[PDB]
Amino acid sequence: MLQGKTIVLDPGHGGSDQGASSNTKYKSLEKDYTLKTAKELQRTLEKEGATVKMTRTDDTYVSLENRDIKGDAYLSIHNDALESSNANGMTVYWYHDNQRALADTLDATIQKKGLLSNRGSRQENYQVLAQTKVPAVLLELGYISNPTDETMIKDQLHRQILEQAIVDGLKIYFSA
């Protein structure tokens, strides 16, 4: 059951580290939108009866090493830039064996509801994934470099579709 589990949310970047930024008139900063996303997901997860730990709760710098918080699952939230502005969509990254089921489960439910192109579940060595024994995934929830993804990253109603689809995946992930 998802109810009673501890979920760690890691909004990427923060503080002096802005993360990626769009080139449009919006001049969006990745650090601002990962944190909005994590705070929204925190509320929805707590309504579902999960305990939520945040690697940061405000616009503060946190080193990758200091993002190693324990839980039953761990979701790193990013809105990175790709060099082609036409590249777009959502990716879920896993690295250790025990992270794959989480990435495969979330990729399936997010595809059903989210308005992002599905770039799939991929194996990649990110330090927040490699440094932890917790089932952890890195979510790219749209690329801030893509103008049309950016319109959805900036939009609470689109974010909330993504956030519900993540909750849907966690409920399947924790079905035992």
């Binding site: 449009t24 008139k25 509320r43 929805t44 309504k47 502005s85 036409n86 777009n88 969509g89 059903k112 509801k113 989210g114 308005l115 992002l116 192109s117 599905n118 893509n146 103008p147 049309t148 319109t151 959805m152 609470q156 109603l157 689109h158 909330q160 579709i161 519900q164």
Partner: protein, 122 residues
């Protein structure tokens, strides 16, 4: 007066729907949206919000059905045409997505988001 320089006011129904959606009460949002559409009090934003609700709690497929229904009533809606362009891009139907965004550009040829997506899809 000064209220044409300002944003378009949401009507009361859309504001109630949105407020339930952002407080996470998608059940009550859906009921308010349903009643608004059935009484014929809906505008294109009502159909937009209704399908967004469906994408959130039902499926993207049902959301897209609801937006297409809204376009039958509001064929020149930039909101609904843009949203269906985004949705069809997410399903890798870029030829259909490009049709939709060009309709949205018909409504609003200076809109930089519509321009950006059409540029992307061209």
């Amino acid at each position: 007066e000064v209220l044409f320089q300002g944003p378009k006011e949401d009507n009361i129904y859309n504001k109630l729907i949105k407020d339930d959606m952002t407080s996470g009460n998608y059940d009550n949002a859906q009921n308010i949206a349903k009643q608004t559409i059935n009484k014929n009090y809906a505008d294109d934003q009502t159909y937009y919000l209704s399908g967004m609700i469906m994408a959130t709690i039902n499926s993207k497929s049902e959301g897209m059905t609801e937006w297409e229904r809204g376009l039958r009533m509001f064929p020149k809606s930039g909101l609904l045409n843009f949203e269906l362009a985004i949705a069809n891009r997410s399903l890798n139907d870029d030829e259909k997505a490009l049709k939709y965004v060009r309709k949205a550009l018909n409504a609003d040829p200076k809109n930089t988001d519509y321009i950006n997506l059409e540029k992307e899809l061209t």
